[PDB]
Each structure stands twice: as C-alpha cells, then as structure tokens.
Amino acid sequence: ITDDELKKVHDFEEQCIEEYFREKDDRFNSSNDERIRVTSERVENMSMR
Amino acid sequence: ARSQIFIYGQQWPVGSLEQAMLDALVLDRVDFVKLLIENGVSMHRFLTISRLEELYNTRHGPSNTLYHLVRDVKKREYPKGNLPPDYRIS
C-alpha cells in the first residue's frame, strides 16, 4: 500500500487498540465481582468513618 | 512519587528525567515508566542506540535466557564457544 493508506491503516489500528483496551476496562468495571469488592471496601471504610 | 515528587510547580533539571527513565527501565518498574511517560518523557527523544545497548546489557531486574541465546548464536556464527564474562552484547 501507499503512504496515505499506511497512515489510514495505522490510525485504524490505534482506534481498535483503544477500543479494545478501554472496553476491557468497562467489562472489568461492570462485572459482579468487581462491583461486590468495591461495595465491600466502601462499606468497611464507611463503617469506620 | 506521584503525590509528592510530581506535584505542580516542581522544577526538573535537564536530562535528569531521562536518567530516571533509564533507571526505571533497568529495574523493571512498569508503573514508574507509566508515570514518567505521563509526565512528559517521550520514547522518541529518549531511546538511542547506546541506551538500548545498555538496556540489553543490564544486570538488574529478573533473570533471562538471553545470554545462552547469544552464546549459541556466537558458537554457530564462529565455530570461541563460551562468551567472556565481561562481554558487551552488541
């Protein structure tokens, strides 16, 4: 491919990498286990406070 | 380091951040690499040939099997044998 097409392909790859990483973060943050753990830690700190 | 050393208005000497970058790289400190990158240090202006050669010749951090690979390819290229202990891997 040419150079503009190479830039377009590289930008598409960076978009895909960002999409995948932060969607993985959204999946981790919306899971039941992470929610339960965050709630328990907040409830413990809230009980001491 | 994030909450005290990298506070707002902190004066930084020229070239010290790249030295801290090299020291964090040779000691396998991923979060310090992240913090230094987020605090202005760029890999394009930092990474040189000599710095990469120093990174390949470091002795800190975890163990690796790179020396055995270098010894094997040196034995295959020039059939010598065991590398000298004070060998700089080019």
Binding site: - | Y8, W12, L17, I37, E38, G40, V41, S42, R45
Partner: protein
C-alpha cells in the same frame, strides 16, 4: 494548498527598538533573529505553519490540527476552514472558557466536579470548547479534564483552543505545510514561553507578529464567536446557536470580558464557579450580597473594595474603577449564574450551564424545546 492561499501571516520586519534590552526588540525576539504596522512595520505573506501536531509524550497520544493565521483575518474564512477542511459539523452549543493566565490550584472536589461537568456538557450536546490554547491555569485544568475523559470515556470532545503564535514553545518545531510535526510536551521552567496543551483537538494560533506577548488572540476569538453565534442552528425555528461563557478564577481582565459579554446584542449568559478564588470569588461575593442588582449599600461596597485591594493588590482608585466595572456588570444580574460547591447550587455544573442558556435565550418554550431537542437532553 487552500490554507496557504486563503490564510495569511505576518512577521517582524521593524527598526529594532531596544526599549530596555538591546537584544529585545518591540517584538521581543532576538536582535539578529528577525527574518500591526505601528513600530513593528510587519509585512503580509502566505503561511508556512499548518497541518497536524503529533503530541509526543504526556501519556496518551493525540493528534491535533493547527494553523497559523493573522490576527486581522475575517472570521468567515476561519469558520469555512473548520467546517470544510477540518470536517467539523456546526456545533449545537458554543462554550467560551476564560480565566487567569497564571497557573493556579483549586480544591480537589471542585476540580473533579468542574471537569466532569465540562466533559459531560461538551459530550451530550456536542459542543465546542474555546480555551486559551497554551497549557496554563484554567486551560491546564481543562486539559486534565480531557485527560480524564480520554481515560474513562469513548468520545472525541471538540476543544478548539486559540493561543498567541509568538508565545508557544518550540515555534520552529511546528513549521510545515500539511505535514505532521512532532511536538514535545516537556516545558522548560527557565523559559517564559509555555507549551501548548496536549489534549486539545484544534488550534487557531494567531500571530500579530510579536513573540512572548499576549493580546494577539482576544479580538479574533470574540469576532469568531460572534460570527458563529450569527449562524442559524439546524432546527430552523429562528434562533442561532447558543453561547455560554464559563469563568474560572480570572484576573482584572475577565471582569471586562464579562462586561463585554453581558452588554452585547444578543446577550451572552455567564456561568461562574466558586472556590477557585480571585475574580470569581469577588463576583460571587457581589452576587450573594447584591439585593436589587445595582442597589448595593455602603458596607458591602467597602467590603468589596477592600477585598479587591487585598486579593488583586490594587490601589484605591484602581479598586474603585474595578468596583465601577463590577456594578456595570451587575446591572445585568439576571444573566450571571453562579455555581457554588456543595449547598443547593444545582449540585452540578451542567444543570447551571444549560439552565443559564435556557434563560439567556429568554425566548418562548418552543425555542427552549427545540434547543433541548438539538442537545438531545430529555431530562433538562
């Protein structure tokens, strides 16, 4: 090739007046470094600095388009540039963020609330954020908010910053014609020049010729905002796009900016924030202690005078003139919406901003409904 043949630029060909330092000319640049017409004798030429900036370092990698334009260019050409060459649709909302050029630190809760509000307001309505461009103070806070937005959200906030061309660091690094130029986010503390903000989307870096001095972008930014507000919104009910003015901290000049915004046809609502300090705090102290607008009694008048003379370190007559400008601003007390951290100050930036826009338009409920339909805000 259209950018070079449409936009122009100016450079310092003067008689080199030393004023104080023999190397420092009227433009401030070095005496041998050379190559308005009053004392600068500047000449006009096609531009040589436009394209794309690749922000190297500073965490996330972000590409920001840029163009160097003259300070006297007509805003229609600039708006055509953003709509056509940069492929930006016409915004449903314009936000003008003003503040102090000096760096400052705010409370953590106030900073988090302000950043989340600015991000959500620019996201839901698809607005344009207008900053000072360089990475100083309030624009630094906006850049931190955009960094958080990139760290936890999937949108692309259009955050066009307008900065003086002569005050940005590494001016030779941004020289090119439609060429991607790398930029360094490192800023030398010894140099008085400041770097551009890393997390901005577009730049309208304006050159009046001079280097290291401000004032080369205020008139162009105001004219561009007026020209944008003159454009009709896509609802076609008979209204232009709404313009708000967010003020954080600020100095003596932002009071004059607020006066220019309020005493305008059409009027522009102004939203201020409390807890940052300086001019925003004196505006808030005026707003709570105001009674019937300009009807301010003597005791709080003297309190305002002494707080102006203490915070801004001004003289007696300067504080009196600033209080006169405050009262001239206050005559229009209905437009100014004051956000207070905690309490019953809408508990959010965006409720205050959108409510201020709704009663700054001051039109019929069909017009407010069409504005809310354009912003896709059913809750508002």
């Amino acid at each position: 090739s259209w950018i070079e043949r449409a936009f122009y630029k100016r450079e310092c060909v003067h008689i080199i007046p030393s004023t104080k330092d023999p190397h420092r000319c009227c433009c401030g640049r070095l005496i041998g470094q050379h190559v308005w017409s009053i004392s600068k004798h500047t000449q006009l030429s096609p531009t040589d600095a436009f394209g794309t900036i690749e922000f190297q370092g500073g965490g996330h990698s972000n590409k920001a388009m840029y163009v160097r334009v003259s300070f006297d260019t007509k805003p229609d050409l600039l708006l055509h540039l953003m709509t056509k060459e940069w492929q930006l649709e016409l915004p449903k909302l314009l936000i003008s963020v003003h503040g102090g050029l000096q760096n400052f630190e705010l409370q953590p809760k106030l900073k988090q609330v302000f950043g989340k509000g600015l991000i959500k307001a620019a996201m839901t309505t698809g607005a344009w954020i207008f900053t000072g461009g360089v990475n100083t103070g309030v624009i630094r806070h906006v850049g931190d908010a955009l960094k958080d937005h990139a760290s936890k959200s999937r949108g692309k906030i259009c955050t066009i910053g307008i900065a003086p061309w002569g005050i940005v660091e590494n001016q030779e690094d941004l020289i090119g014609r439609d060429v991607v130029r790398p930029y360094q986010t490192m800023s030398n503390p010894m140099s008085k020049l400041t770097v551009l903000n890393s997390m901005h989307s577009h730049f309208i870096l304006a050159d009046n010729g001079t280097t290291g001095k401000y004032g080369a972008e205020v008139k162009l930014r105001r004219q561009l905002e007026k020209h944008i507000s003159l454009q009709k919104i896509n609802t076609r009910i008979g209204q232009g796009v709404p313009v708000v003015a967010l003020i954080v901290e600020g100095g003596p000049n932002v009071i004059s900016i607020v006066l220019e915004y309020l005493r305008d046809t059409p009027p522009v609502p102004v939203v201020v924030c409390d807890g940052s300090g300086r001019a925003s705090d004196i505006l808030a102290f005026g707003h709570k202690y105001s009674e019937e607008g300009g009807l301010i009694n003597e005791s709080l008048r003297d309190q305002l005078l002494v707080t102006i003379q203490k915070t801004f370190t001004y003289t007696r007559t300067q504080a009196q003139h600033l209080f006169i400008i405050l009262m001239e601003c206050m005559k229009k007390k209905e437009l100014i919406t004051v956000f207070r951290m905690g309490s019953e100050g809408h508990q959010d930036i965006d409720l205050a901003i959108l409510t201020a826009l709704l009663k700054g338009a001051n039109a019929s409920a069909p017009d407010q409904l069409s504005l809310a339909l354009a912003w896709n805000r059913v809750d508002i």
